[PDB]
């Protein structure tokens, strides 16, 4: 991805957009009960903690575009992945406005919380004023579509979240490039059934895990994998995507029956954004921060891995590549060992920066013992080995519980963390609960005991 130009929005007929400058994150009642080192990300140029230009830092993610056209290796990758998706008999029919808005089997309703984007953000109009869960009214939305159309600028927001001290000082805050409600709705009408099919089929055929439930899905992943695992991390995946990857995605869509609306992919590839009082044009790069792009980023990841394997290992049998992606995150396997370091080298030529899995200093063999997916390790249950626990280390959980964004959601926040932590074992879980109950706020919470969670897990299969 590359920024073509940037300048005063006024010069191009757009208004100044107002975005919060103060974090909603504040120390929680557990701030001194647990260890942690993360702080709220810098949200403005004037933040005292900054040690470099903020504007430069947040847009440095656009490293440029390494490739223009789709080569022969990418074409083969497209043919193989598209052929694989064809086995799912995905309904190519457009989804009606109602379901696209309020959800249906395999697709959740629009998030009434998130931004409505332009121009609604500048008109002070919220989603709550357009959508009616109880009525499932599409009248209002339909008139807004007719009035403002599609292909609207994306509203850029800085993400309010915890970051390491280094990322804070270097102003390395992540961004949210919100699509207008109009575009979000139009894209779900065009691809709604595709989204539903992926959400309903997490695994090695879709090569996707979006919409998955780790508590249950972890037990299914191992049997789908080939003998030798391989993985790696990407540095700034979304922003690094070159225009060629978007063209390869359109080819996949065309082959599976959506050639009808590949134009929507262009909107993601060549897009314009509004940030504060400026407007800018980007070539390449997947608009980041929102879930609406999770599926497309996952599909593209399937194309990238296939391409690098074909380019690095002529004669590779893709029918035996078994991988599952969630955006840029991935767990993959093949019957034979492969060299991730070599694959990373090939990746540079395609505009991708690949590094050792889980932040290792060197590319080491990936095993069921050290592999992680969505930050969770895999651990067989002591009593029932066939049941696999998704294990997220307590470090991140401890980092999270030390801050709060709303005193009213304290119990939901802590309960969600408990659902993650108990997988670490009864001993660790009880220590976690004991510390929570060492302060008044914690003692007033209704939290599940270990045996209660273990029983509920067994009863969920
Ligand atoms: Na873009």
**Ligand 1 mean position, distance from CA 177 (Å):** 10
Task: Tell whether 328 is in a known binding site.
Answer: yes
Cα of 265 to ligand 1 centre, how many Å?
9
Task: Kindly tell me the burial class for residue 70, based on how many C-beta atoms sit within 10 Å of its own C-beta (0-12, 13-18, 19 or more).
Answer: buried
State the distance from the centre of ligand 1 to the C-alpha of 262, rounded, in angstroms.
15
- Where in the chain are all domains bearing CATH 3.30.70.270? 213-242+292-367
Q: Which CATH class is domain 213-242+292-367?
A: alpha beta
CA-based angle 134:135:140, to the nearest 5? 125
Q: How far apart are the CA of 413 and the centre of ligand 1, in A?
A: 33
Positive or negative, the CA dihedral 294, 296, 299, 305 is negative
CATH class of 375-461: mainly alpha
Which residue has 């895999």 as its token pair? 378
**Total Cβ atoms within 10 A of residue 318:** 17
| H, E, C per residue of the chain | CEEEEEEEHHHHCCCCCCCCCCCCCEECCCCCCCCCCCEECCCCCCCCCCCCCHHHHHHCCCCCCCCCCCCHHHHHHHHHHHHHHHCCCCCCCCCCHHHHHHCECCECCCCCCCCCCCCCCCCCCCHHHCCCCCCCCCHHHHHHHHHHCCCCCEEEEECCCEECHHHHHCCCCCEEEECCHHHHHHHHHHHHHHHHHHHHCCECCCCECCCCCHHHHCCCHHHHCCCEEECEEECCHHHHCCHHHHHHHHHHHHHHHHHHHCHHHHHHHEEEEEECCEEEEEECCCCCCCHHHHHHHHHHHHHHHHHHHHHHCCCCCHHHCEEEEECCEEEEEECCCCCHHHHHHHHHCCCCCEEEHHHCCCCCCCCCCCCCECCEEEEECCCCCCCEEEECCHHHHHHHHCEECCHHHHHHHHHHHHHHHHHHCHHHHHHHHHHHCCCHHHHCCCCCCHHHHHHHHHCCC
As annotated, the residues of the chain forming the CATH 1.20.960.20 domain(s) are 375-461
Distance 287 CA to ligand 1 centre (A): 6
Q: Which residue has the tokens 């069921």?
A: 368
Measured in Å, residue 354 CA sits from the centre of ligand 1 at: 20
In Å, what resolution does this model reach? 2.0
- Experimental approach: X-ray
Beta bridge partners of 388: 380
* 433 CA distance to ligand 1 middle (Å): 44
Distance from the alpha carbon of residue 305 to the mean position of ligand 1, in angstroms: 21
Instruction: Tell how far the Cα of 438 is from the centroid of ligand 1, in angstroms.
Output: 48
């Amino acid at each position: 991805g590359e920024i073509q130009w940037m300048r005063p929005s006024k010069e191009v007929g757009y208004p100044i957009i107002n975005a919060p400058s103060k974090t909603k994150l504040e120390p929680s009642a557990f701030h001194y009960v647990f260890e942690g080192v993360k702080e709220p990300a810098v949200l403005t140029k004037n933040d005292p903690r900054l040690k470099t230009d903020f504007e430069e830092a947040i847009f440095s993610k656009y490293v440029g575009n390494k490739i223009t056209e789709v080569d022969e290796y990418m074409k083969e990758a497209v043919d193989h992945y598209a052929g694989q998706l064809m086995s799912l008999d995905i309904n190519t029919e457009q989804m009606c406005l109602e379901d696209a808005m309020y959800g249906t089997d395999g697709l959740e309703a629009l998030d009434l919380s998130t931004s409505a984007g332009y121009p609604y953000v500048a008109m002070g109009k919220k989603k709550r004023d357009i959508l009616n869960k109880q009525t499932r009214d599409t009248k209002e939305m339909q008139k807004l579509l007719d009035t403002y159309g599609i292909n609207l600028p994306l509203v850029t927001y800085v993400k309010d979240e915890l970051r390491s001290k280094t990322k804070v000082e270097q102003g390395k805050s992540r961004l949210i490039e919100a699509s207008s409600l109009n575009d979000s709705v139009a894209m779900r009408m065009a691809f709604g059934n595709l989204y539903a099919a992926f959400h309903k089929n997490p695994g090695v055929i879709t090569g996707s895990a979006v919409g998955c439930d780790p508590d249950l899905f972890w037990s299914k992943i191992p049997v789908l994998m080939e003998e030798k695992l391989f993985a790696f991390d990407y540095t700034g995946y979304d922003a690094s995507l070159s225009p060629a990857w978007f063209e390869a995605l359109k080819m996949v869509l065309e082959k599976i029956g959506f050639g009808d609306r590949v134009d929507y992919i262009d909107y993601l590839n060549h897009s314009h954004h509004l940030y504060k009082n400026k407007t800018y044009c980007v070539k390449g790069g997947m608009p980041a921060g929102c879930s609406g792009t999770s599926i497309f980023n996952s599909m593209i990841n399937n194309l990238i891995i296939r391409t690098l394997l074909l380019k690095t290992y002529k004669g590779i049998d893709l029918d035996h590549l078994k991988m599952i992606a969630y955006g840029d995150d991935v767990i993959a396997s093949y019957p034979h060992e492969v060299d991730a370091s070599l694959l990373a080298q090939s990746g540079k030529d395609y505009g991708l920066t690949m590094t050792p899995a889980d932040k290792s200093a060197t590319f080491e063999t990936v095993t069921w013992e050290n592999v992680t997916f969505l930050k969770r390790f895999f651990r067989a249950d002591e009593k029932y080995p066939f049941l696999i626990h998704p294990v997220m280390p307590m470090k991140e959980i401890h980092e999270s519980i030390r801050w709060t964004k709303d005193p009213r959601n304290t119990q939901d926040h802590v309960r969600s963390l408990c659902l993650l932590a108990w997988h670490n074992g009864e001993e660790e879980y009880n220590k976690f609960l004991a510390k929570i109950r060492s302060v008044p706020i914690g003692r007033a919470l209704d939290l599940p005991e270990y045996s209660t969670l273990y029983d509920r897990w067994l009863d969920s299969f």
